[PDB]
Design a protein around this ligand. Structure first.
Ligand code: ANP
Length: 327
């Protein structure tokens, strides 16, 4: 009941060799070439440690996957393998596992990150333009290769501000895009979930990541994290409606023939479109420009087919200072 505007054809054109991650044979590395040092992060499905690849004595990242459906492990590995050498995608170094328990780990390149709540407010307007544009290179790449990231949130973007370098990480929710496939809507982080997830519209595509990038981008330029701050997946849709308005929400549901949950209507009610200008203040004015708002406004749409493609987004006037500086 939806197909993507772009890249709908990719997985058909690349082999079954490219998306059939169920039939992947995993060449496990050697567990004991890696020694864990320092625990640096935590997810619901993973341990992340700073570690050493002992033979090279190299700092790397080991991510210990909570034993979970083997199918899912097979998917993340094949995706990482596929995307290899792509711009600003985290480098996959190894896959290992325990001899006895068979608990797998992914070994990835280390990135000297700064936590975003500290790093983002140190940003200039050029900085935001530059790093979003480098994030747009990763989304455009992986989308061009039939893959939706599906967890694009600042926690999964690692920025080394001294090297001026960027990596997208946590491809644990990523999928291959197949035209017409119904996908699980329980993806993303509540704050970065697109409306299509919140109304249980299952036939979504790469445009999910663009909404997500929009929320992240609104955090940065408006200095509100999160920009939409829902207490649960129901309230999340309400916080979105208080900004984009409900008039546009009902034309969107009507256009895609979504019927809402019955008790959604005790809580939603009627909201006029709050304009983007009403979010400007003295403390966030540094990031604000007529180009930024226009760009943000073409990511944050109810209808996933009115959103920019990562490629169209790269052409936007907002990124002209970074394109120019490139040369
Ligand atoms: N390559 C890396 N370099 C540095 N830190 C990293 C790297 N990969 C992951 N981390 C840290 O580990 C945290 C969790 O890693 P992540 O890959 O997001 O695992 P997860 O279990 O999928 N968690 P979640 O994002 O909630 O789904 C990240 O937020 C980073 O702070």
């Amino acid at each position: 009941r939806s197909v993507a505007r772009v890249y709908a054809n990719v997985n058909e054109k690349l082999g079954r060799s490219w998306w059939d991650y169920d039939n992947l044979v995993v060449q496990w590395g050697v567990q004991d070439n890696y020694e864990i040092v320092r625990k640096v992060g935590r997810g619901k499905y993973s341990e992340v440690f700073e570690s050493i690849h002992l033979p090279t004595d190299s700092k790397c990242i080991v991510k210990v996957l909570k034993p979970v459906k083997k199918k899912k492990i097979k998917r993340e590995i094949k995706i990482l393998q596929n995307l290899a050498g792509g711009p600003n995608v985290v480098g996959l170094l190894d896959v290992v596992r325990d001899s006895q328990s068979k608990t797998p780990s992914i070994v990835t390149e280390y990135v000297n990150n700064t936590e975003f709540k500290t790093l983002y407010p140190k940003f200039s307007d050029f900085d935001v333009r530059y790093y979003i544009f480098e994030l747009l290179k990763a989304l455009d790449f992986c989308h061009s290769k039939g893959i939706m990231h599906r967890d694009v949130k600042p926690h999964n973007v690692m920025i080394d501000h001294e090297k001026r370098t960027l990596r997208l990480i946590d491809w644990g929710l990523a999928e291959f895009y197949h035209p017409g496939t119904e996908y699980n809507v329980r993806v993303a982080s509540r704050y970065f979930k697109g409306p299509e997830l919140l109304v249980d519209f299952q036939e979504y595509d790469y445009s999910l990541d663009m909404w997500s990038l929009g929320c992240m981008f609104a955090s940065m330029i408006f200095r509100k994290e999160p920009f939409f701050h829902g207490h649960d997946n129901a309230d999340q849709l309400v916080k979105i409606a208080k900004v984009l308005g409900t008039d546009e929400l009902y034309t969107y549901l009507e256009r895609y023939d979504i019927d809402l949950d019955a008790q959604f209507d005790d809580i939603l009610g009627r909201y006029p479109r709050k304009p983007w200008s009403r979010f400007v203040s003295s403390e966030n004015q540094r990031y604000i420009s007529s180009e930024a708002i226009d760009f943000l406004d073409k990511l944050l749409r109810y209808d996933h087919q009115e959103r920019l493609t990562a490629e169209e987004a790269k052409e936007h006037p907002y990124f002209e200072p970074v394109r120019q500086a490139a040369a």
